[PDB]
């Protein structure tokens, strides 16, 4: 009985300013999210406070990243305590952009996860295999190694959700279908049940982090092992509300 | 403008929280800012907005980093636009930790600088050699190589400040001999004069990003080619209001 | 220079004598060196001079190792100066046997590289993981860890070549699957791009130091991220004049 | 009746280039060595051939090291056959720098000795206790264990000479006198006579490998059990000739 509460995150990435963002917050603030869905918004780092202040207490705020120490000589970086200090209760970790564009390693990612969590912050842990990894059929290998690192650094799965990112269908000329989406979420839940525990795997939300719009959210949402989304571009528009109601 | 207005930058790095930073902000706001000086506080990204809202108008706020595009799929990053949108007028680029801990290349930094200036932001470009390089005498080459890449992306030095940081010795009160800081800064000024213009070099601030305590800040500024500092730890201590007044 | 001139290195190791090496040298001297390629022969230290004197100017000579100081009480060692003084322009550092049989640490190798480059010599820095490491998936980490240490000592990649060697499988004709060689070399090129510069990665030769016969040298170079080899045994066989022409 | 022919080796270590070395060879080539003294020069590995070619047939050439196999996958290493192939008739083995700076073990040293010898090459076998070993009074213990390994790998003492190295007086703040030099050579000859044979001990030359200059060579040479030297620094200068005439 997968009573997993639908999870819908909105990764604005590096987009928006007070104006467009405040305007965005206005739409969701005036929107009516299903009492059965959990909605989170990940604003640009400079607008985490702005967003949380303007954001309706019903919606949680999430950082798009953080470091592995409470304080230190790390110009440009922020710690989970600040993220908490700003009212944000979540942190996106391991986003494909952070791993690839910025080269963040699993080791460092594993350390931010353990720290973020120790700091009492929720954690949206992102995984996903690149195009070549997909072309080889190493999807399982790749995604299990990343999840494992996340699991070894997670002593409590209540504060975490998994987001699978089909980086292989991101600007590559390959398209990811909802079936192959489920296929992956399946193995990931299978990895948990087997490597963690039956309960954890049954409660842990595994959200889809691939191309999601109000037009395709219904299909993807109907998938058994897909209990949520981590929306990118669409999280900047009114359509985000439609995605908030995909499971419905 | 021949008279290079003193420039005291305070790099808070990844330290403090609203409460803490609030106590610090409230202080500087009670600190008289001599027209003979130009003070700037670089708060962690999450607190750029907060500080700018609480901080005194006479004091400028500066992001500790930014990306090289107005908007994009760059989770965890912020654009010059955003910083500016938050009331900050400056940006720190090339910092010791950014390139030596997060591997930011000169290339990337040159692109950030070009974009930051192009966005209406002022930037504090950082440079400095390492211990292996210092103990090689290639300190001038490495710093010039770094300054060249930055200068290649600067078309107007009106809103630009150079920051030399002796990476091979920064943090504790073990302030590297003021003579060593003068030698480098002197060559940098001789670089801008020939590679740009006598006026540019005679109007460009070459602040010291090394060990600067609320006391040692005297003999340091005492040097002819040292128009300020990029205070690290002390920038957090109330002794930051002193380093600002490193004279009389 | 975008077009990365093919680089075929021949590592003779500890084999041959004047007679033998003379027969080999006389051959390559009759072998036309395509401008599309850059061939180098690394003779045993005792025969560096001999080979350089007999070898064709179009072919470069390379020591198989050197020390990290111009001169000193280091019986049994040679300095970059000496190698250069013998007409050799390159040096092999970090080779599988040097660190895995004679326990040379990355540190030592990083110092040799820094000194070699500083002495006017070109260097072929070698890297590669072991079987225990390969069978751990930490191949990328180990090779990056090795490349980092080397890059930390390189200030000009104009006279530098990377050499990946699959230690867990080198020697016989059991050439490790060309895909495995491509995966690693591909990541290394993505490393230099971000850790150094797109230009550097798009101008840096990443030769394969694994199993390269006078035949298999086709499908190997066929891979996009394989700009040459570091021929082991075959470098002694007349089939070395073929591996040089691993195309058409 | 110790009719042991005076032996004087010159360990140039890692010093010189064609120019200074050729200049050095010029002095000895033009020098007149006593028909009763045996002179050997150990050039940097890269100059063994150079030296032998420029060296007067009266003086022998010696490698400063070698490996334990005729040929093989040992980049940077050379075999006794090459050393022979270059006209060198000697090999320095076990030099303190090789044992300490490079960690060569007695086992490996014992194997190079047996191989070098099997290859028909003379062998300057080096021994000597470190500072701490000397401080403890383990001189005998230490030096007997090393000599033993050399003896077990020597089935013919005609092709070998022993060089005692007071490593304990090498850059340590301790100075070695000619008396304590003899003291050690005494025991070493006592070790031979007792563990090898009376004849071997009476014919085997045991040369001093400590600080030796034309100013102190006379004193050391007059010692009964000191029948030669293994000169370091002084072997690079004209003074080497004076040492060649110390016994006189």
CB count, 10 Å around CB of A136?
Answer: 14
Using a CB-CB distance cutoff of 8 angstroms, which residues of chain D are in contact with residue C74?
Answer: 13-14, 97, 101
Integer Cα distance of A50 and C191 in angstroms: 36
CATH domain D1-248 topology: TIM Barrel (3.20.20)
Integer Cα distance of D105 and D126 in angstroms: 12
Q: Name the residue among A157, A143, A39 with its Cα closest to residue A96.
A: A143
Facing A145 at nearest CB: one of C137, C186, C195? C137
From which experimental method does this structure derive?
X-ray
Closest-CA residue of C relative to A145 is C137
Using a CB-CB distance cutoff of 8 angstroms, which residues of chain C are in contact with residue B99?
Answer: none
Sequence ranges of the binding site of D for substrate: 11, 13
Residue C243 has which token pair? 């591996």
- Verify whether residue D95 is a known catalytic residue: yes
Using a CB-CB distance cutoff of 8 angstroms, which residues of chain B are in contact with residue A47?
Answer: 49, 82, 86
Facing B13 at nearest CB: one of A19, A49, A73? A73
Cβ contacts from A onto B, under 8 A: 137
Residue whose structure tokens are 């070993």: D133
DSSP state of B46: G
Question: What is the distance in angstroms between the Cα of C244 and the nearest Cα belonging to chain A?
Answer: 29
CB C63 within 8 A of CB C88: yes
CB proximity list for A175: less than 8 A, separation 6 or greater: A169
Length of chain D: 248
Substitution target in C183, C186, C192, C196 with the highest count of A β-carbons within 10 Å is: C183
Residues of A with CB under 8 A from a CB of C: 103, 105, 107, 132, 136, 145
Question: What is the distance in angstroms between the Cα of B216 and the nearest Cα belonging to chain A?
Answer: 21
Using only C-alpha atoms, chain B has a radius of gyration, in whole angstroms, of 17
CB D42 within 8 A of CB D63: yes
Q: What are phi and psi of C48, to 5 degrees?
A: -60, -50
Facing B76 at nearest CB: one of A16, A79, A98? A98
Residues of D with CB under 8 A from a CB of C: 11, 13-19, 42, 44-50, 63-65, 67, 69, 71-79, 81-83, 85-86, 92, 95, 97-98, 101-103, 232-233
Record: contact C183-A105, CB cut-off 8 A? no
Record: contact B136-C152, CB cut-off 8 A? no
CB count, 10 Å around CB of A142?
Answer: 20
- Every domain of chain A and the residues it spans: 1-248
Record: contact A132-C194, CB cut-off 8 A? no
Helix (H, G, I), strand (E, B) or coil at D20: helix
First-to-final CA distance of chain B: 23
**Touching chains D and A? (3+ Cβ pairs < 8 A):** no
Integer Cα distance of D246 and D248 in angstroms: 5
CB A128 within 8 A of CB A94: no
Question: What is the distance in angstroms between the Cα of C147 and the nearest Cα belonging to chain A?
Answer: 15
**Touching chains A and B? (3+ Cβ pairs < 8 A):** yes
Integer Cα distance of C145 and C148 in angstroms: 5
Residues of C with CB under 8 A from a CB of D: 11, 13-18, 42, 44-50, 63-65, 67, 69, 71-79, 81-83, 85-86, 92, 95-98, 101-103, 171, 232
Substitution target in C46, C51, C61, C74 with the highest count of D β-carbons within 10 Å is: C46
Question: What is the distance in angstroms between the Cα of A110 and the nearest Cα belonging to chain C?
Answer: 14
Using a CB-CB distance cutoff of 8 angstroms, which residues of chain B are in contact with residue A73?
Answer: 13-14, 97, 171, 232
Closest-CA residue of C relative to D104 is C102
Longest dimension (CA), chain B: 50
Integer Cα distance of C128 and C168 in angstroms: 9
Record: contact C76-D69, CB cut-off 8 A? no
Integer Cα distance of A207 and A161 in angstroms: 7
CB proximity list for D133: less than 8 A, separation 6 or greater: D139, D141, D142, D168
CB C102 within 8 A of CB D108: no
Q: What are phi and psi of C172, to 5 degrees?
A: -70, 180
Closest-CA residue of A relative to B91 is A76
Give the resolution in Å: 2.2
Record: contact B46-A83, CB cut-off 8 A? yes
Using only C-alpha atoms, chain A has a radius of gyration, in whole angstroms, of 17
Composition of chain D by helix, strand, coil, percent to 5: 45, 15, 40
Record: contact B103-C198, CB cut-off 8 A? no
Using only C-alpha atoms, chain D has a radius of gyration, in whole angstroms, of 17
Question: What is the distance in angstroms between the Cα of D1 and the nearest Cα belonging to chain C?
Answer: 34
Using a CB-CB distance cutoff of 8 angstroms, which residues of chain A are in contact with residue C183?
Answer: 132
Record: contact B46-A63, CB cut-off 8 A? yes
Closest-CA residue of C relative to B145 is C155
Using a CB-CB distance cutoff of 8 angstroms, which residues of chain B are in contact with residue A77?
Answer: 14, 44-45, 102
Residues of B with CB under 8 A from a CB of A: 11, 13-18, 42, 44-50, 63-65, 67, 69, 71-79, 81-83, 85-86, 92, 95-98, 101-103, 171, 232
Residue A4 has which token pair? 């997993």
Facing C13 at nearest CB: one of D11, D72, D95? D72
Q: Enumerate the β-bridge partners of residue D142.
A: none
Cβ contacts from B onto C, under 8 A: 22
Residues of C carrying an active site annotation: 95, 165
The angle at the Cα of D157, spanning D156 to D159, to the nearest 5 degrees, equals: 90
Integer Cα distance of D221 and D234 in angstroms: 15
Integer Cα distance of A180 and A205 in angstroms: 18
For residue D143, the number of C-alpha atoms closer than 13 Å in the C-beta half-sphere is 30
Q: Name the residue among D60, D3, D7, D1 with its Cα closest to residue D227.
A: D7
Task: Tell me the three-class secondary structure of chain A, residue by residue.
Answer: CCCCCEEEEEECCECCCHHHHHHHHHHHHCCCCCCCEEEEEECCHHHHHHHHHHCCCCCEEEECCCCCCCCECCCCCCCHHHHHHCCCCEEEECCHHHHCCCCCCHHHHHHHHHHHHHCCCCEEEEECCCHHHHHHCCHHHHHHHHHHHHHHCCCCCCCEEEEECCHHHCCCCCCCCHHHHHHHHHHHHHHHHHHCCHHHHHHCCEEECCCCCCCCHHHHHHCCCCCEEEECHHHHCCHHHHHHCCCC
Q: What are phi and psi of A102, to 5 degrees?
A: -105, 0
Closest-CA residue of C relative to B101 is C195
Neighbour subunits, D (≥3 Cβ pairs < 8 A): C
Facing B105 at nearest CB: one of C153, C155, C194? C194
Record: contact C198-B106, CB cut-off 8 A? no
**Touching chains C and D? (3+ Cβ pairs < 8 A):** yes
Integer Cα distance of C79 and A223 in angstroms: 66
Closest-CA residue of A relative to C182 is A132
Q: DSSP letter string over D50-77?
A: HHHHHS-TTSEEEES---SSSSBS-TT-
Composition of chain B by helix, strand, coil, percent to 5: 40, 15, 40
């Amino acid at each position: 009985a997968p009573s997993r509460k639908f999870f819908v995150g909105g990764n604005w990435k590096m987009n928006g300013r007070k104006q467009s963002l405040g305007e965005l917050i206005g739409t969701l603030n005036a929107a009516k999210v299903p009492a059965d869905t959990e909605v989170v918004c990940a604003p640009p780092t400079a607008y985490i406070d702005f967003a949380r202040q303007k954001l309706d207490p019903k919606i949680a705020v999430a950082a798009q990243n953080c470091y592995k120490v409470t304080n230190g000589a790390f110009t440009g970086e922020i710690s989970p305590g600040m993220i908490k200090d700003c009212g944000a209760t979540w942190v996106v970790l391991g986003h494909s952009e952070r791993r690839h564009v910025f080269g963040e390693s699993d080791e460092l990612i594993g350390q931010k996860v353990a720290h973020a969590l120790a700091e009492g912050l929720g954690v949206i842990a992102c995984i996903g295999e690149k195009l070549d990894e997909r072309e080889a059929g190493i999807t399982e290998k790749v995604v299990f190694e990343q999840t494992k690192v996340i699991a070894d650094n997670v002593k409590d799965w209540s504060k975490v959700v998994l987001a699978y990112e089909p980086v292989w269908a991101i600007g590559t000329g390959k398209t990811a279908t909802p079936q192959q989406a489920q296929e992956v979420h399946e193995k990931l839940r299978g990895w948990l049940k087997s490597n963690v525990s039956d309960a954890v795997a049954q409660s842990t939300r595994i959200i889809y982090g691939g191309s999601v719009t109000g037009a395709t959210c219904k299909e993807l949402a109907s998938q058994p092992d897909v209990d949520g989304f981590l929306v990118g571009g669409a999280s900047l528009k009114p359509e985000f509300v439609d995605i908030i109601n995909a499971k419905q």
